[PDB]
Amino acid sequence: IFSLWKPHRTYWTEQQNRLPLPLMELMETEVLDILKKALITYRSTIGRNHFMTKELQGYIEGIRKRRNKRLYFLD
């Protein structure tokens, strides 16, 4: 009731979302390992002469900036 009510109800509106766990932004290290294995099999496949090559290159820098935001200063 009153100023107790109208704020905190919206916070359980916050309580449904995708809600990543604290380790869901760091569990992908072996996912990077298996996709970099896909990169080295892909380098054994066709090399750099290609453009879906360029889109998976855009994917590897996209996840590079996606992991960089938690790993700028952590190193």
Binding site: H8, Y11, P22, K69, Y72, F73
Partner: protein, 179 residues
């Protein structure tokens, strides 16, 4: 069901070996946090015994390095959510005043040796304390009890948030009611 229970039983038996380095026990405590969250409610009242050891070691923050303290930050952050017996268990048993006690870290004690890890500690402790908020009435009264933290809350309004899902400090100040 019970295979998760028994495997955390023996790795908890590693957890009460005193004569070892703490870091493998810290990633073990990460495994309790993730496995207890992916179990559900029944895993949480199974794991209702196991905060004695981590509650014992969270008062020794002045001895170990920053890796150990940030590791039990996401251990309690992974454990705490959607957990009712937890969220009235912790404010009677020295947790959120201990997070306040964690927060003096470096604004009066140290200045710089390599002080980037200090704001990494603030990032992980604020992401720890947003996910313990739930919808109760008890905890923000004693959050209103302290005095200087709002000023420090102003400081976590000042610093930039790089690549986070959203800025947790401004929804924190929205939920803390000093606006």
């Amino acid at each position: 069901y019970i295979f998760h229970r028994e495997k955390i039983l023996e790795l908890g038996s590693i957890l009460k070996n005193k004569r070892l380095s703490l870091d493998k026990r810290a990633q073990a405590a990460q495994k309790i946090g993730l496995l207890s969250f992916t179990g559900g409610m029944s895993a949480a009242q199974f794991a209702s015994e196991y905060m004695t050891e981590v509650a014992f070691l969270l008062q020794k923050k002045k001895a170990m390095s920053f890796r150990t303290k940030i590791l039990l930050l996401q251990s309690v952050a992974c454990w705490c959510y959607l957990n009712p017996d937890s969220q009235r268990k912790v404010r009677q048993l020295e947790i959120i005043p201990t997070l306040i006690d964690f927060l003096e870290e470096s604004f009066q004690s140290s200045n710089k040796t390599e002080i980037n890890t200090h704001r990494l500690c603030q990032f992980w402790v604020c992401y720890a304390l947003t996910v313990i908020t739930c919808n109760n009435l008890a905890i923000m009264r004693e959050l209103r009890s302290y005095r200087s933290l709002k000023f420090h809350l102003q400081l976590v309004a000042t610093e930039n948030w790089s690549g986070w899902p959203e800025n947790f400090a401004e929804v924190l100040y929205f939920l803390i009611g000093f606006h």
